[PDB]
Scaffold this active site. Sequence first.
Site, PDB file in Angstrom:
ATOM      1  NE  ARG B 100      -3.011   0.884  -0.682  1.00 15.37           N
ATOM      2  CZ  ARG B 100      -3.095   1.089  -2.004  1.00 15.37           C
ATOM      3  NH1 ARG B 100      -2.645   2.209  -2.600  1.00 15.37           N
ATOM      4  NH2 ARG B 100      -3.606   0.126  -2.753  1.00 15.37           N
ATOM      5  CE  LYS B 135       0.021  28.956  -5.712  1.00 11.92           C
ATOM      6  NZ  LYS B 135      -1.289  29.597  -6.105  1.00 11.92           N
ATOM      7  CE  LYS B 167       5.719  34.774  -4.070  1.00 10.11           C
ATOM      8  NZ  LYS B 167       5.249  34.027  -5.274  1.00 10.11           N
ATOM      9  CD  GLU B 197       3.956  36.861  -8.013  1.00  9.61           C
ATOM     10  OE1 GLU B 197       3.045  37.609  -7.515  1.00  9.61           O
ATOM     11  OE2 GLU B 197       4.129  35.640  -7.716  1.00  9.61           O
ATOM     12  CG  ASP B 218      -0.575  37.458 -11.295  1.00  9.42           C
ATOM     13  OD1 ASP B 218      -1.281  36.460 -11.610  1.00  9.42           O
ATOM     14  OD2 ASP B 218      -0.427  37.868 -10.124  1.00  9.42           O
TER      15      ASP B 218
END
Lengths: 283, 283, 282, 280, 280, 282
Positions: B100, B135, B167, B197, B218
């Site tokens: 598993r 992420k 950013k 960004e 962006d």
Amino acid sequence: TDLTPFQIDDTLKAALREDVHSEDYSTNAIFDHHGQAKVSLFAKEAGVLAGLTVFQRVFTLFDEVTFQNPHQFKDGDRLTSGDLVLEIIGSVRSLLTCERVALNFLQHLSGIASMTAAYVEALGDDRIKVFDTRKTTPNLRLFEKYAVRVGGGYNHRFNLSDAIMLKDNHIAAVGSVQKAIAQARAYAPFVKMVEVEVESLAAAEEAAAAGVDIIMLDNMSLEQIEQAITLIAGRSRIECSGNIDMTTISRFRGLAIDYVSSGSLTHSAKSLDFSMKGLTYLD
Amino acid sequence: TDLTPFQIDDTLKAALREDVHSEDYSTNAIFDHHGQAKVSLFAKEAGVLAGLTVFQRVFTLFDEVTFQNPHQFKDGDRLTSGDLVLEIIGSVRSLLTCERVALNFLQHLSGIASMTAAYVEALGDDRIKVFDTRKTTPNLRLFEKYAVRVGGGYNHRFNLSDAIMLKDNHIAAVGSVQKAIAQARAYAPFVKMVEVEVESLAAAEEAAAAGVDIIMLDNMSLEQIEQAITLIAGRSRIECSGNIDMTTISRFRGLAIDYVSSGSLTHSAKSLDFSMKGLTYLD
Amino acid sequence: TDLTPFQIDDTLKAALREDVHSEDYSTNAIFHHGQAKVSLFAKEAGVLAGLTVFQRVFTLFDEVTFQNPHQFKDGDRLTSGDLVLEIIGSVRSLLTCERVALNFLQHLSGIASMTAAYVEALGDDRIKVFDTRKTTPNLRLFEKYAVRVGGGYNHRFNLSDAIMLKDNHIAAVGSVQKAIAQARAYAPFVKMVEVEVESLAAAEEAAAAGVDIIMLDNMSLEQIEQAITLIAGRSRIECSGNIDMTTISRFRGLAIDYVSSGSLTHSAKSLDFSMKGLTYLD
Amino acid sequence: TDLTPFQIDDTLKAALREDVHSEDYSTNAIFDHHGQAKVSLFAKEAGVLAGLTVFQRVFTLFDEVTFQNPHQFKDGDRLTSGDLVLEIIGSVRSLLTCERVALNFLQHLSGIASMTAAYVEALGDDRIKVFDTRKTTPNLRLFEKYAVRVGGGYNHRFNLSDAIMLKDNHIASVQKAIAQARAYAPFVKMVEVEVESLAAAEEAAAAGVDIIMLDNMSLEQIEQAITLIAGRSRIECSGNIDMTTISRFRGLAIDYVSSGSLTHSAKSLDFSMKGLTYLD
Amino acid sequence: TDLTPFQIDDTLKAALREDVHSEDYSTNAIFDHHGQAKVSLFAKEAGVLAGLTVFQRVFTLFDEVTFQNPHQFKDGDRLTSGDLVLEIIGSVRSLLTCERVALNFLQHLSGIASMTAAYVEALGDDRIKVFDTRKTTPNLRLFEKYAVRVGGGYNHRFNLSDAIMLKDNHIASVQKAIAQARAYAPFVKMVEVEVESLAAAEEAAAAGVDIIMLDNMSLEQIEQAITLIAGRSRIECSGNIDMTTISRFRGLAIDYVSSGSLTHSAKSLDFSMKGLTYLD
Amino acid sequence: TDLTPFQIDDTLKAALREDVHSEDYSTNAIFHHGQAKVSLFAKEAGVLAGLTVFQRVFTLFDEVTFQNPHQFKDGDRLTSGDLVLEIIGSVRSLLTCERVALNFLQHLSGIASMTAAYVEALGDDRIKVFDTRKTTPNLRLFEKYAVRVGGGYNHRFNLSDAIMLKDNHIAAVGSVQKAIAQARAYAPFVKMVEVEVESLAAAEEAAAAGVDIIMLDNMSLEQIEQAITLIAGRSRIECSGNIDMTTISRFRGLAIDYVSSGSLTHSAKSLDFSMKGLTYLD
């Protein structure tokens, strides 16, 4: 019941260390003077909130950070895009450096809770519970199990050590449903629940007669399922499993089974979108 | 380039320990006599294979286990349901107890590789690369980054320490695109790439003039994007990001940008289905 | 089923490190990387447990081989003067790795022996002897193993294994039936639920509530007997508390499923062994 | 001197992790919106108290927990059944989930202290000292050594690295062994020799060793050896020592005795946590 | 006596993890279907070799790597620039990714050994011994202590728990301090006292201590103290000791000297890994 | 930017444990939980680094407070006899936690001081002084910090931070341009790429290939100068190898971006401090 620091701290630390090997250069280059600041956590998508105290703990392990919760949000609550879930107050460096890790937890867990909630609704039968599995993201089982409970689901065994499950091959090796069950009982008496996965109506009978705790009806047709129910006559708990998703789950509506289980809740959950925005310095 | 034991061992051990706190009662109750056995790993769904040596390593850390690979499968190869990817040979207890955890890795990574591959095709432009993000699933970034490369994608910075990314808020705190870039450079000279960004055509100009390495456009419109390209004139590398998925990604086809990035590749990947079946004892 | 390196290695390493902070000066000063043989002798009668653990201490440290003339294994009965094992390797590895290995072996064999003694004292096959969570910190796995080796059985390893509603849990909720109800609502189907009960009334309440196991805590034989009939096979029955060598026989012949004892693990005397008879090898 | 978080924390954490792999289901199932609760720690058996702060630390690593000590109990104090040692205050979840681990430490250490205390009383001679050994429970040596001090005993070397002790194989010219030890060691290690015959005891004393161990050598032998050694070294008597036996050494001019059984096979001392009530 | 995996492994792993957080991009980018490769370890500076097996272990934890040692070099041997110490054989990935960490150990330990060796030669008296201190690089004491032995030096206590040493605040009746140490300690710890005045040296020797430290006390003072101590204790001279200074002690009847600078501020010894070639 | 508890705590704890295996017998035998004060003195001129590290050693161990009469901080110049800090707490905490704290402080201040000295010796603001990966195992973070404190700059922390194609990498591939090409293909855009080069030809090859940084390895001034013009600002330029106190001045006034030195971290002499003047407190 919420997750405790004892349970989550080592995992969150590891995560922070993964995202910062020396320092957060981008944040440290621009920001200094160490003023307190405030940032807002916004839901960006509709679903169910899970992992809020986990989110918080990421900041708190790193630095002195406080929170404000204007709407008294808690795990389980429904979210709508634009909702102000939390305000986070502390030094700028702590807020920006901790952000992504914190969100990564929150997004992932809320995604699972949301999906679990969706499955429950799609099923539309209170009398039938929705259970998870061991098909979990390695080293995060605890967190995923929690998110499933939050979304209205239930937990299966955590482990290979928790409970006994006699699958397809186990029966064959012993050559009788009844003997496999007997050996399990002999090996771990009294303190372990025993479950058997069964593909056949005959086997379901054999197993119910043997006095097992739970019988798993594996990828069986509704006709087959219904016959088994009557045949078993409440001598065991009944789980349906396999090929269970959003579209399929409604087929079980109204049957006299105890629960269904789905791996997708944990292995294939979309994360739920949030953002941290509106950074302002405090007066 | 494949993942090494140095890189993965601690994580796989932890995972094994998560799934077995005392013993695997279900396997130990039925199986004994310690005969060697063979089990087959089957693909159950079409996609891309990733994490095969990770899969293998789970068994190898636990016990003495050997493998046979009849079709010479390796990470990157296309899979079709029913394909025999591997045969696993060893003691029954080792095969069933490790199953598993091993699959959980393999399913997850192959899911990401598959999805990355799908995005690349949907884009249908070699000249534009597909990049991942931060992420990622906490404590598995390494593995997920790898799966993205396997699927034909590319890696962005691993970390907040790897590279600089200025950013939305960073520009505001300094009050000039040009000054934020200057402070970054002053703070971490020469050995860090710097990215910004940008939401605005003016800002894209400012940034290109300042000599940054990479400009992130962006969630900009195609008209906006096209203007920026001409405006920047190859003074920086150009990344498009935000609201990028299977349906959307094709809009970038044929633009003179260097790459696009997607969080969904890692935060919202469906796992790819496999099974281990056909257990037989060796003569 | 024997313990394994995956399970035990980190613990044994820690133990070796505890006993050797820099080096074994006394052994090194006198010695060769010249092979030698030493014998492991049983010095007291009882049951052998932890033999492969004993062995592993040496094997983690250096290249060491073993001879087992009498084919001894965990579970076998021991009598003083018995040659359990011969250990072959460099003198430095044998002397330095001796105390730790024995410490494991003596401890586990002590537990197995005591477990075996309790089983005999009980003299009823139909009633099993179980352990508890009253274990030596950070050795539970090993102690649980030794109990099995001595003919005992394992209770839950953990707070995560099964639910047990004890005195203190009942107090926090204020009712037996309510505590069971909550447990049942919280972990349906896949967790066994057990309740500790001091009174017949509570035993009734519990059986009616449909628990899996009722623990009769420090109850009299008269009480126990009444409870049995009264429970009427709605649950499994465990007796516990004030259970030792002298006391255990009182349960003989009752229609209970098992008894449990903390003393098996918290108060086990170690079984005596020694390592002697160092020949040199060539 | 009491144990410290710096010394004990990692061990206690590991112990907590051993007892809770996922969650404490039994306790979590009964979770409610109650406030803080109080529980009492009772001695259930007579002996000596050891490991109280260890007991406390198990709770304090886990959660916010406070204590009340009505009778000002501390490690070393004598216990009688029914004694209220401590009150523990905190959330119900923390009290019940930490209980067993905390008690396991306390019971184990109080057991050793008690047994040590009993050996001291049994021998009855303050002139002698009662020493422990390396026959300790793996990975708890530090804690067991502490308990022995608490029970009125003394600590032998913690380690193979602490001090030198000359054994049987090592014993096989025993003045040359001493010489090599002192040479092979830097001049910063005590040296001890285990001796079976009176001849060896003399050679050793002449050698200028720090401690001579008289191994399972009987009273007449012992008495001759003492005189022969003539204070050139410290004298330890060891082997065949038990609650019954220890009294044989009463009044001899030896410095100490040692016993493995103190740590080796100590019964744990019974305690319980009961009387859970919610605060107002 | 060489270091062991049981002793060093956790440290080396941590070091490898420090140097590779995700992957070795530079090396992975050049990955090919080549076979095994060979690389040579060269000494680039004269001194003493220490930490060779440590060097080796860094590779061996990571991957399958073998070695060839044409000149049979071992820890303690003298080095001259251009010497071929080792050949390392294995996959290119393993060689390049392990290199820097392995060298960092080797360079650091060979540096200390070298410096120790230089101090020994400089003092020139075999009658004296050169000892180290606790002024060590945090978390590498074990390795540094080893290097000092390799360079012909000797080890002082590893620890505050190893042995007793009486300091300035501690010094503030200095015979009473000795008494309390011996009493507060079990009779298994060496006791040493640091003394500034000749009066104190005598009190101490009379007290029966094991080692007397003459602190920054000059040759006339030292010489008087020796005579006064009259072999009642071992004598250590310490403070203000360096490559230049060490020679002042040549020929005195003291037992040893100690230097922090040996571990404290040792230059690392230069090595390089070069000559990468593929095997056939 | 200062080091933090999250970053340093585990290391300091390990260091304390290294120095105290059971207890500090010598300090405990003589002492009180009675407050005392001790002074930290600089005993040698240089640059102060690691002050909050020094402090943290005490703070992890016990409740300890500090007084800083002269408002000293990392980066400040030191002269012998300077009172850097007063440390207030129990005598046992001060004596036991002294050697470890100083060991950190002495080491880091030594590195900062040496870095500061190299910068001055170079006497060119336009050229920066960088460190390397030739660091003391398991203290890189601390050493990198000390270099910044002394006015230096940090090179990559890691093999994962940036790409550097060295001699051995070039050999494995057999070409400079091919090695760059592969690096560029493997980690596009987000990783800097650097190459170590021994010859002018290779410097050309590299600049043409479009790398970010060229390292001129142990090259002569004549060579260096030619390379500069020849590279023509297509890359940043680093000089490295055989760079020490005596040598570093030779780079003065060249149009290179920086130099790097391993000696700053692998061969730094520690800076002398002492803790003395224990008053008792009331």
